[PDB]
Amino acid sequence: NWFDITNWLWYIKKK
């Protein structure tokens, strides 16, 4: 689901 991509991106870009 394309609509889930930015959540993944947000999660991996946290520190």
């Epitope: 689901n1 930015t6 947000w10 870009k13």
Partner: antibody, heavy 124, light 109 residues
Framework: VQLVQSGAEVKRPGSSVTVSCKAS????????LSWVRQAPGRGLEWMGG????????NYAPRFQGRITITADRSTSTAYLELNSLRPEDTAVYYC??????????????????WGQGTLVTVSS | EIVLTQSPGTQSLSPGERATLSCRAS???????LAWYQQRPGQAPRLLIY???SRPSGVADRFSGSGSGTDFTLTISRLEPEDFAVYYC?????????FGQGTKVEVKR
């Protein structure tokens, strides 16, 4: 987050239209920006969207072959191009960006932020 | 393509009354990614509910969403004058997002 679209335009049948959507506030590159249209007296129709950082587009099958959605990170502007215009394409075109939840910027997918719309009239 | 059915397409109700609006999907909606929007004439749509039941901070708590799978409902606990408007559901549980055709909540007299 405020989305500001380019102004109304009249386009001839068979031509191509480009509509712009400039975002101010928050981050541009990591949130999904979609285009949704509404023909006169009709409902909302999702056309497609882009995730700028990744350059990943996602088009509705109905528009796949006629649409291009692009993002310019230097100006926080997204663009909709729609080709081969027909009178049925007369509509208000909205850009719509996904919302966030909490304080950490977590995206929600659903469209919290909407531009003012752009009326594209296809006519001779 | 998931078809979202909003039936009835119009509800005639009085101010102060409760409203329940149905959105039925032709297939199960992935992870209950179902949103509701309000739209008044001449205005852009506005997000009321996302993820079937979550409500953004700014949105009046008289709006609530419920349901899962193929069977979703927007509830307006008590209709205020500004609530008479059109309501759209939208699924985004797969890459092809779709909207319902809308339900107009209008004033019965």
């Amino acid at each position: 987050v405020q989305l500001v679209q380019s102004g109304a335009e009249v386009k001839r049948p068979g031509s191509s239209v480009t509509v712009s959507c400039k975002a101010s506030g928050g981050s541009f590159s990591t949130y999904a920006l979609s285009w949704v249209r509404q023909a006169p007296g009709r409902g909302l129709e999702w056309m497609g969207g882009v995730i700028p950082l990744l350059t990943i587009t996602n088009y509705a099958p109905r528009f796949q072959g006629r649409i291009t959605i692009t993002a310019d990170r230097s100006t926080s502007t997204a663009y909709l191009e729609l080709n081969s215009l027909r009178p049925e394409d007369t509509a208000v075109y909205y850009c719509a960006r996904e919302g966030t939840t909490g304080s950490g910027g977590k995206p929600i997918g659903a469209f919290a932020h909407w531009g003012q719309g752009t009326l594209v009239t296809v006519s001779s | 393509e998931i078809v979202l059915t909003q039936s009835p397409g119009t509800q005639s109700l009085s101010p102060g009354e409760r409203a329940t609006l149905s959105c039925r999907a032709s297939q199960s909606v992935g992870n209950n990614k179902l949103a509701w929007y309000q739209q008044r004439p001449g205005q852009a749509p506005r997000l009321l509910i996302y993820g079937a039941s979550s409500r953004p901070s700014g949105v009046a708590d008289r709006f609530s969403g419920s349901g899962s799978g193929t069977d979703f409902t927007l509830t307006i606990s008590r209709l205020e004058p500004e609530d008479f408007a059109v309501y759209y559901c939208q699924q985004y549980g797969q890459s092809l997002s779709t909207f319902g055709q809308g339900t107009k909540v209008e004033v019965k007299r």
